[PDB]
């Protein structure tokens, strides 16, 4: 609880009550998820880090073009 108080006072300038968070979370449906992902995640840049036996790792460009579909 103390970590939640302090972290929120620095980030938001206040503590959000539990009821407010639950009210904001309640009105998010599938059409709002689609809107936000289309704006920020669709056809976007990616960064990658890796370690170990990586002979079969995809190309960066393969990962970059997997952020969109050609169907639809």
């Amino acid at each position: 609880v103390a970590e939640d108080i302090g972290r929120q006072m620095l980030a938001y300038g206040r503590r959000m009550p539990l009821a407010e968070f639950l009210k904001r979370l309640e009105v998010i449906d599938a059409e709002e998820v689609k809107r936000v992902a289309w704006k920020y995640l669709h056809d976007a840049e990616v960064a990658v880090a890796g370690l170990g036996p990586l002979f079969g790792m995809p190309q960066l460009i393969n990962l970059r073009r997997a952020t969109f579909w050609l169907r639809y």
Binding site: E45, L60, I61, R64
Partner: protein
């Protein structure tokens, strides 16, 4: 380390290194290709010069 192609200049690097790449390629090909070609060209001329003279030594009066 690799950078995304959407965040690179991709035509300027070709011309930035043009003179070095052209020197390497043209220097490699000079002796092996050009020197036999000049000899073949010369033989083509000598051949055509002897054909003409041989026609006049047999048909012209």
């Amino acid at each position: 380390q690799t950078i995304s192609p959407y965040q690179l200049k991709f035509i300027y690097p070709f011309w930035h290194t043009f003179f070095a790449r052209c020197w390497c390629k043209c220097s490699a090909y000079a002796w092996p290709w050009v020197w036999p070609g000049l000899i073949t060209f010369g033989l083509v001329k000598k051949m055509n010069h002897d054909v003409e003279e041989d026609i006049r030594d047999h048909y012209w009066y």
